[PDB]
Design an enzyme around this catalytic site. Structure first.
Site, PDB file in Angstrom:
ATOM      1  N   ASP A   1      -2.314   5.450   2.497  1.00 35.36           N
ATOM      2  CA  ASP A   1      -2.940   4.253   2.980  1.00 35.36           C
ATOM      3  C   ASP A   1      -2.863   3.098   4.247  1.00 35.36           C
ATOM      4  OD1 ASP A   1      -5.289   1.485   2.450  1.00 35.36           O
ATOM      5  OD2 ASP A   1      -4.402   2.350   0.355  1.00 35.36           O
TER       6      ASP A   1
ATOM      7  N   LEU B   1       1.000  -0.951   0.135  1.00 37.40           N
ATOM      8  CA  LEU B   1       0.508  -0.037   0.427  1.00 37.40           C
ATOM      9  C   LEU B   1       0.929   1.088  -0.137  1.00 37.40           C
ATOM     10  CD1 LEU B   1      -1.380  -2.179   3.017  1.00 37.40           C
ATOM     11  CD2 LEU B   1      -3.025  -0.714   2.444  1.00 37.40           C
ATOM     12  N   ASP B   2       0.438   2.138   0.756  1.00 36.80           N
ATOM     13  CA  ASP B   2       1.158   3.672   0.736  1.00 36.80           C
ATOM     14  C   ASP B   2       0.865   4.030   1.630  1.00 36.80           C
ATOM     15  OD1 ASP B   2      -1.600   5.329   0.575  1.00 36.80           O
ATOM     16  OD2 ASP B   2      -1.876   4.294  -1.259  1.00 36.80           O
ATOM     17  N   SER B   3       2.378   5.213   1.960  1.00 38.07           N
ATOM     18  CA  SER B   3       1.962   5.659   3.611  1.00 38.07           C
ATOM     19  C   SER B   3       0.631   6.522   4.006  1.00 38.07           C
ATOM     20  CB  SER B   3       3.097   6.986   3.737  1.00 38.07           C
ATOM     21  OG  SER B   3       3.206   7.600   2.514  1.00 38.07           O
TER      22      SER B   3
END
Ligand SMILES: CCCCCCCCCCC[C@H](O)CC(=O)SCCNC(=O)CCNC(=O)[C@H](O)C(C)(C)COP(=O)(O)O
Ligand code: SF4
Ligand code: SF4
Ligand code: SF4
Lengths: 115, 155, 115, 176, 209, 85
Positions: free
Chosen positions: F43, F39-41
């Site tokens: 997220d 995922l992303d930071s």
């Protein structure tokens, strides 16, 4: 001398029944903090000139009315309040030490008009 | 006659709708001076049956006066929706009707008609008090030129 | 040369830290603003709309600019909860009225003679 | 020099306090308001009977425009284009191409009423007093499009408000 | 006045504020890069970004300045210089009926510590500058948008935001609200390239490059 | 009754399962958000917020960045909750 000032003519600015003595004690107080700053600073070179100057006028002439003309500062309460913020202004630039040369020179074409 | 009775009733219904309509303001700018400078004794409007009154639920015509900024645009729209029917709006001033001076600036809508369905346009920068009084007179004459019950009966 | 003064950030770490609870504040902001302002768009619709606006400001690599986006970012949420803004203001980011600008070469070529 | 306003030092004598107490107990300053208002009532009003009579104006009054003409009917406008060069709202648009008799006079003179400011800079800018601020103001319309003026509308108003404008400009050219 | 056309000039005022300019220069020569008197007898102080609090406090309480009336604060944004935003204050002293101008320089990113400690008048003379120009002043009570639409983007009074802006409002039936859209003009604001190709003033002539 | 770690284990993994992006397949006991799950930071800020509603708890941002997989989520909250079953 004179009877007590009914109103200074400036709301919020109340009256003080001890004009000369309160001016004096505040005046030695700003003399005190003037000591910590170096003498060579133009601050101290200029404040002590007006310190010893108008400390003499308040000390020599004790009357409220004659002091008003000699200092052109309205009522005494205005003058001592004016000298009060002088004390606070003395404290601020005590820690500031704005005596060294410019922090840095301005950019080459930062000033000068027109563009 | 069938048309005659609806004709008499139509006149009676709108004869005083043009004489008892009561103006409404928003008073944005220098046009808000003539807004009520006409309520001053000289160019009396209270005599004309009109009388200024905000009361957005209980007024007939709003005289949009001043420069219409985008920031206020929600406020006018919510006022016009809260406005009861029948309702008319009068665009007083060049800025209100067509932007005028600030037409090219970023924070004024170019004319009020882009925001509200705009009735009789009274021009002026500002419109000298009687010019709107003339404009209000035109609005009342327009009220006579109405066939409300006549159109309903025709349908 | 590279010497610049801060406002809130030194390293991207703390710069990305500020946008973290900025998301946190915004993440918990969606459930109340949609209900209290009486919209039609869904809760997750708002949440992803908050989400995507983060991605627009993602190609910058300067701790110096992000905080300026942070203060601009923190200059809007309070304007929503405290009913300062209006329906035309917060549904504006929900870009709805305008037609979809063509993206392929032919469709742009067909619509007009502009890039 | 200055004078005080609020300070009154109301005297606390038995007579003076009686007047203050009487004023409070049996209201007197309020009845003064009634007396002033009633005196206002018994005075003829200042209202004007529009349109049967309309308030005064001046020879310098700035209203609806009009493009004037010479004694023989020639357009005074020559498309020197000074008027929109000073039009603060850029409400004037002018184009010129050749006219049949060798001339190249104007074709377009559209002063958008909904853009115009009625400052009167145009009539001062005109070196041949072609565009002027007419005395008329009763030109309210129910369509935004009507206020958008064109060349023919301007010329028609010049022929409509002609005698009045000619007298005004004759009574005002010494001031200007 | 033997020359009624020209504005008569005064010299007793000219040298006195010139002397006072030196006076302030000596008192705190840490921040004042240079002081410029004017032919209009409006002496101006040119300060450093960190120098905002010292000089402003200095003119506020000093016994020979007493400049405590904040006239205005604004920006004179100049693209051609690296510090585009030129923050300038105007001060008034009732006791000595004089007006002092203090001028700074700032980029888009560099902050300025808020002058609300010196004058609470700046409280709103601070907000609009952040809105109208975009320069942000540190440690200020609030940095809210005061002179723009809610959700408005950019900074108008910059020399980058065009006159017409980018967004235009209109009330639409489908949404039953006044929604936005990219600006479109019935008339384009025409250009008036009016700067003459002949030199106007030899006195203020720019030095050759 | 106390709040056990097998409870912590399931409910931490429960709402992690509920959020749309996570697929049941790649989820595991480790299921590291960055290099395992993916995922992303932001997220990462999303899931820890989902943890807040699941537990009715509060976590600071000073420790939200290190919570890089459900195991830390399980361990971290079990640490402050002072329940070790
Ligand atoms: C409906 C409500 C109103 C309407 C909606 C209103 C939405 C407002 C949102 C807040 C303001 C603004 O639009 C978005 C912001 O904060 S942007 C983040 C900037 N911060 C940076 O650091 C930039 C560089 N980017 C990175 O360093 C990383 O890429 C990142 C942090 C993105 C993580 O990426 P990954 O890894 O997760
Ligand atoms: S039309 Fe003229 S008077 Fe009316 S708001 Fe616009 S500028 Fe002001
Ligand atoms: S109206 Fe007068 S100033 Fe304007 S274009 Fe015609 S002649 Fe020139
Ligand atoms: S009076 Fe109207 S048309 Fe004439 S210069 Fe002024 S704004 Fe332009």
């Amino acid at each position: 001398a004179g009877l007590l000032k009914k109103t200074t003519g400036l709301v919020g600015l109340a009256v003080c029944e001890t004009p000369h003595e309160r001016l004096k004690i505040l005046y030695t107080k700003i003399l005190d903090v003037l000591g910590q700053i170096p003498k060579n600073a133009a601050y101290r070179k200029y404040t002590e000139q007006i310190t010893n100057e108008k400390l003499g006028m308040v000390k020599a002439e004790p009357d409220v009315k004659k002091l008003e003309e000699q200092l052109q500062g309205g009522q005494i309460e205005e003058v001592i309040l004016q000298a009060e913020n002088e004390l606070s202004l003395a404290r601020k630039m005590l820690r500031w030490k704005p005596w060294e040369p410019l922090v840095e020179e301005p950019p080459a074409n930062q000033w000068k008009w027109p563009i | 006659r069938g048309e005659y009775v609806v004709a008499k009733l139509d006149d009676l219904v709108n004869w005083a709708r043009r004489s008892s309509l009561w103006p409404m303001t928003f008073g944005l700018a220098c046009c808000a001076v003539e807004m009520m400078h006409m309520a001053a004794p000289r160019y009396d409007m209270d005599r004309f049956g009109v009388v200024f009154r905000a009361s957005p639920r209980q007024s007939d015509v709003m005289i949009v006066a001043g420069t219409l900024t985008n920031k206020m645009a929600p406020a006018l729209r919510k006022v016009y929706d809260q406005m009861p029917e029948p309702r008319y709006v009068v665009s007083m001033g060049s800025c209100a009707n067509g932007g005028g001076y600030y037409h090219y600036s970023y924070s004024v809508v170019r004319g009020c008609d882009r925001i509200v369905p705009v009735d009789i346009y009274v021009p002026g920068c500002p419109p000298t008090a009687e010019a709107l009084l003339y404009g209000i007179l035109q609005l009342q004459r327009k009220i006579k030129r109405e066939k409300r019950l006549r159109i309903w009966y025709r349908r | 040369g590279t010497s610049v003064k801060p406002i809130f950030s030194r390293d991207m770490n703390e710069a990305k830290r500020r946008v973290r609870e900025l998301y946190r504040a915004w993440y918990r902001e969606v459930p109340n603003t949609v209900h209290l302002f009486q919209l039609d768009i869904s809760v997750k619709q708002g949440r992803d709309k908050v989400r995507e606006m983060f991605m627009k400001n993602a190609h910058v690599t300067d701790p110096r600019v992000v905080d300026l986006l942070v203060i601009k970012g923190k200059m809007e949420l309070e304007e929503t909860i405290n009913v300062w803004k209006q329906r035309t203001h917060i549904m504006r980011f929900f870009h709805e009225t305008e037609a979809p600008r063509p993206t392929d070469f032919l469709s742009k070529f067909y619509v007009g003679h502009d890039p | 020099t200055y004078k005080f306003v609020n300070m009154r030092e109301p005297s606390m004598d038995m007579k003076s306090v009686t007047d203050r107490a009487a004023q409070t107990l049996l209201w007197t300053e309020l009845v003064r308001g009634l007396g002033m208002t009633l005196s206002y009532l018994f005075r003829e009003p200042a209202t004007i009977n529009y349109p049967f009579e309309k308030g005064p104006l001046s020879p310098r009054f700035r209203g609806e425009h009009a493009l004037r003409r010479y004694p023989s009917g020639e357009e005074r406008c020559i498309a020197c284009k000074l008027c929109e060069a000073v039009c603060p709202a850029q409400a004037i648009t002018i184009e010129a191409e050749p006219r049949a008799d060798g001339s190249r006079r104007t074709t377009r003179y559209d002063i958008d009423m909904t853009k115009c400011i009625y400052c009167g800079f145009c009539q001062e800018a005109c070196p041949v007093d072609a565009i002027v601020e007419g005395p008329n103001f009763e030109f309210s319309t129910e369509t935004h499009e009507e206020l958008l003026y064109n060349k023919e509308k301007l010329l028609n108003n010049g022929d409509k408000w002609e005698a009045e404008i000619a007298a005004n400009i004759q009574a005002d050219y010494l001031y200007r | 006045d033997t020359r009624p056309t020209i504005r008569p000039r005064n010299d007793v005022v000219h040298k006195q504020l010139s002397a006072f300019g030196q006076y302030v220069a000596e008192i705190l020569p840490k921040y004042v890069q240079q002081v410029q008197v004017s032919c209009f007898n409006e002496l101006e102080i040119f300060i450093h970004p960190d120098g905002v609090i010292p000089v402003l406090t200095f003119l506020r309480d000093h016994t020979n300045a007493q400049f405590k009336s904040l006239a205005d604060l604004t920006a004179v944004d100049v693209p051609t210089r690296q510090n585009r935003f030129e923050i300038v204050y105007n001060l008034l002293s009732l006791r000595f009926n004089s007006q002092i101008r203090v001028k700074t320089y700032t980029d888009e990113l560099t902050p300025i510590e808020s002058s609300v400690t010196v004058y609470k008048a700046a409280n709103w003379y601070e907000r609009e500058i952040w809105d109208m120009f975009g320069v942000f002043f540190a440690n200020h009570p609030d940095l809210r948008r005061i002179l723009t639409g809610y959700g408005f983007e950019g900074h108008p009074f910059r020399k980058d935001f065009p006159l017409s802006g980018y967004v235009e409002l209109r009330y639409d039936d489908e949404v039953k609200r006044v929604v936005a859209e990219p600006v479109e003009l019935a008339q384009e604001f025409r250009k008036f390239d009016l700067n003459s190709p002949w030199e106007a003033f030899p006195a203020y002539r720019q030095p050759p490059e | 009754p106390p709040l056990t770690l097998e409870a912590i284990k399931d409910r931490v993994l429960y709402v992690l399962k509920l959020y749309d992006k996570i697929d049941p397949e790649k989820l595991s006991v480790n299921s590291h958000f960055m290099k395992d799950l993916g995922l992303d930071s932001l997220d990462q800020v999303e899931i820890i917020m989902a943890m807040e509603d699941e537990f009715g708890f509060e976590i600071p941002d000073i420790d939200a960045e290190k919570l890089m997989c459900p195991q830390e989520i399980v361990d971290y909250i079990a640490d402050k909750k002072d329940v070790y079953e």
